[PDB]
Amino acid sequence: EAEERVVVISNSSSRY
Amino acid sequence: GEYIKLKVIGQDSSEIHFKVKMTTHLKKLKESYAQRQGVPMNSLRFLFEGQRIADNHTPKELGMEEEDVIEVYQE
């Protein structure tokens, strides 16, 4: 029995 | 707005649910699903009511609502 799976789908600091 | 929760049904009847906003591009869902299945995204086709879901389709464009189903098949 699989458990429920819910996935949520939600630059000057750069140095390279 | 609010997230709606979509159920993605695999060929083996497994389910992964995804929360997306009405303006989210569904490529993001497809990529996450393929990642979790351990297969290339381009090996799968995702259907809503039998119609192909494009990378840039949104739930709003497709008329999707809470608890709608997406089916995944091999490409």
Swiss-Prot record, chain A:
Transmembrane segments: none annotated. Residues 6-10 are annotated as: Sumo interaction motif (SIM). Ubiquitinated; mediated by RNF4, RNF111, UHRF1, UBE3A/E6AP, BCR(KLHL20) E3 ubiquitin ligase complex E3 ligase complex, SIAH1 or SIAH2 and leading to subsequent proteasomal degradation. Sumoylation regulates PML's: stability in response to extracellular or intracellular stimuli, transcription directly and indirectly, through sequestration of or dissociation of the transcription factors from PML-NBs, ability to regulate apoptosis and its anti-viral activities. It is also essential for: maintaining proper PML nuclear bodies (PML-NBs) structure and normal function, recruitment of components of PML-NBs, the turnover and retention of PML in PML-NBs and the integrity of PML-NBs. Undergoes 'Lys-11'-linked sumoylation. Induction: By interferons alpha, beta and gamma. Up-regulated by IRF3 and p53/TP53. The record marks A2, E3 as: Breakpoint for translocation to form PML-RARA oncogene in type B APL. It is found in: Nucleus; Nucleus, Nucleoplasm; Cytoplasm; Nucleus, PML body. It comes from the Eukaryota. The coiled-coil domain mediates a strong homo/multidimerization activity essential for core assembly of PML-NBs. Interacts with PKM via its coiled-coil domain. Key component of PML bodies. PML bodies are formed by the interaction of PML homodimers (via SUMO-binding motif) with sumoylated PML, leading to the assembly of higher oligomers. Several types of PML bodies have been observed. PML bodies can form hollow spheres that can sequester target proteins inside. Interacts (via SUMO-binding motif) with sumoylated proteins. Interacts (via C-terminus) with p53/TP53. Recruits p53/TP53 and CHEK2 into PML bodies, which promotes p53/TP53 phosphorylation at 'Ser-20' and prevents its proteasomal degradation. (Microbial infection) Interacts with Lassa virus Z protein and rabies virus phosphoprotein. It is linked to A chromosomal aberration involving PML may be a cause of acute promyelocytic leukemia (APL). Translocation t(15;17)(q21;q21) with RARA. The PML breakpoints (type A and type B) lie on either side of an alternatively spliced exon. Functions via its association with PML-nuclear bodies (PML-NBs) in a wide range of important cellular processes, including tumor suppression, transcriptional regulation, apoptosis, senescence, DNA damage response, and viral defense mechanisms. Acts as the scaffold of PML-NBs allowing other proteins to shuttle in and out, a process which is regulated by SUMO-mediated modifications and interactions. Inhibits EIF4E-mediated mRNA nuclear export by reducing EIF4E affinity for the 5' 7-methylguanosine (m7G) cap of target mRNAs. This is Protein PML. It comes from Homo sapiens. The gene is PML. The chain holds residues 551 to 574 of 882 of the full protein.
UniProtKB/Swiss-Prot annotation, chain B:
Changing F18A: Abolishes binding to PIAS2. Cleavage of precursor form by SENP1 or SENP2 is necessary for function. There is a cross-link at K5, K19, K21, K27, K28 (Glycyl lysine isopeptide (Lys-Gly) (interchain with G-Cter in SUMO2)). GO terms for cellular component: cytosol; glutamatergic synapse; nuclear body; nuclear membrane; nuclear pore; nuclear speck; nuclear stress granule; nucleolus. GO terms for molecular function: enzyme binding; potassium channel regulator activity; protein tag activity; RNA binding; small protein activating enzyme binding; transcription factor binding; transporter activator activity; ubiquitin protein ligase binding. Residues 1-7, 19-22 are annotated as: (Microbial infection) Interaction with Tula hantavirus. The record marks F18 as: Interaction with PIAS2. It is found in: Nucleus membrane; Nucleus speckle; Cytoplasm; Nucleus, PML body. GO terms for biological process: cellular response to cadmium ion; cellular response to heat; DNA repair; negative regulation of action potential; negative regulation of delayed rectifier potassium channel activity; negative regulation of DNA binding; negative regulation of DNA-binding transcription factor activity; negative regulation of DNA-templated transcription. It comes from the Eukaryota. It is linked to Non-syndromic orofacial cleft 10: A birth defect consisting of cleft lips with or without cleft palate. Cleft lips are associated with cleft palate in two-third of cases. A cleft lip can occur on one or both sides and range in severity from a simple notch in the upper lip to a complete opening in the lip extending into the floor of the nostril and involving the upper gum. Belongs to the ubiquitin family. SUMO subfamily. This is Small ubiquitin-related modifier 1. It comes from Homo sapiens. The gene is SUMO1. The chain holds residues 19 to 93 of 101 of the full protein.
